[PDB]
Design a protein around this ligand. Structure first.
Ligand SMILES: OC[C@H]1O[C@@H](O[C@H]2[C@H](O)[C@@H](O)[C@H](O)O[C@@H]2CO)[C@H](O)[C@@H](O)[C@@H]1O
Ligand SMILES: O=C([O-])C(=O)[O-]
Ligand SMILES: [Mg+2]
Ligand SMILES: [Mg+2]
Ligand code: NI
Length: 275
């Protein structure tokens, strides 16, 4: 499920970005680009001092010739004329360096629609830069935009070092992500392929009760391997089911809500595994 249930960002459905938190250990569609001598590598890693939180981590390896020689970006975005966008992120580095952040066209003529008025930011070693601001898309609608961070050339410290990105968001109240319609879902909603052992794992539960409800994780053989109570969130009634510490690989896990008087009181099957 693409929904991230971030407890501090605006609604996922109104975000132009598809990955914001990285807490499940995945970064796609975020990716690097290496150009004109630039080299880098990437991973998703835990953040020291922030338990449960993971960050997109791009290691600069060769600065290359230009600032765009090393990039981390998210493509496929449409900025709409007359709309107001809110830009939020946390970025830091384990070497003092600089970064040029922009939202613009991915190809020629490379129009830039937000770019901190053409100014790079400075990332002092270990010090977090947090951005939270708005801009108006007053140019005509463009469907070739990317949210990108240029790290190369003159912006770069002496490699190697790593730049981290987290809770990155592009919010427009008048935008709703494209949708597929889905069949009525069972009461427990999971990621239908699954989770990495080390990733955050929060399922969504809908049920009649306003109060917490008993849940059991069973393996494929139907044996209970973990139990808890849900955490009620709001309106039937939406609850969260956090099983992040469970890390045991297997195929065909599923939940059941044993006390819930519902013929759909389970989840679909899913896997925990490294793939
Ligand atoms: O074509 C090489 C490379 O271009 C990258 O875009 C750069 C471009 O090279 C540069 O002329 C312009 O001023 O900056 C942009 C980036 O904002 C592009 O990002 C790569 O995908 C492409 O392979
Ligand atoms: O903003 C829009 O037009 C939309 O939701 O596609
Ligand atoms: Mg995600
Ligand atoms: Mg995170
Ligand atoms: Ni509009």
């Amino acid at each position: 499920m693409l929904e991230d249930n971030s407890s501090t960002l605006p609604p996922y459905k109104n975000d132009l970005l598809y990955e914001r938190t990285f807490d499940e250990g995945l970064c796609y569609p975020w990716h690097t680009c290496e150009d004109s001598g630039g080299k880098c590598s990437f991973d998703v890693v835990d953040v020291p001092g922030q338990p449960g939180n993971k960050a997109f981590a791009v290691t600069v390896l060769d600065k290359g010739q230009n600032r765009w020689s090393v990039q981390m970006r998210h493509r496929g975005l449409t900025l709409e004329q007359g709309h107001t966008y809110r830009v939020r992120l946390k970025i830091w580095a384990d070497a003092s360096c600089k970064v040029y952040i922009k939202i613009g066209q991915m190809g020629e003529p490379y129009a830039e629609y937000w770019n901190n008025k053409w100014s790079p930011y400075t990332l002092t070693a270990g010090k977090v830069l947090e951005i939270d601001e708005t801009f108006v898309m007053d140019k005509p609608t463009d469907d070739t935009c990317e949210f990108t961070f240029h790290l190369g050339g003159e912006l770069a410290a002496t490699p190697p070092y790593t730049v981290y990105l987290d809770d990155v968001s592009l919010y427009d109240p008048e935008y709703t992500k494209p949708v597929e319609y889905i069949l009525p879902q069972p009461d427990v909603r999971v990621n239908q392929v699954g989770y990495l052992p080390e990733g955050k794992k929060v399922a969504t539960v809908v049920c009649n009760s306003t109060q917490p409800v008993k849940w059991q994780l069973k393996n494929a053989a139907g044996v209970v391997v973990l139990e808890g109570y849900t955490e009620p969130k709001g309106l039937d009634y939406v609850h969260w089911l956090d099983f992040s510490d469970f890390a045991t690989e297997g195929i065909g896990y599923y939940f059941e809500l044993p006390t819930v008087n519902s013929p759909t009181n389970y989840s679909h099957p899913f896997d925990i595994r490294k793939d």
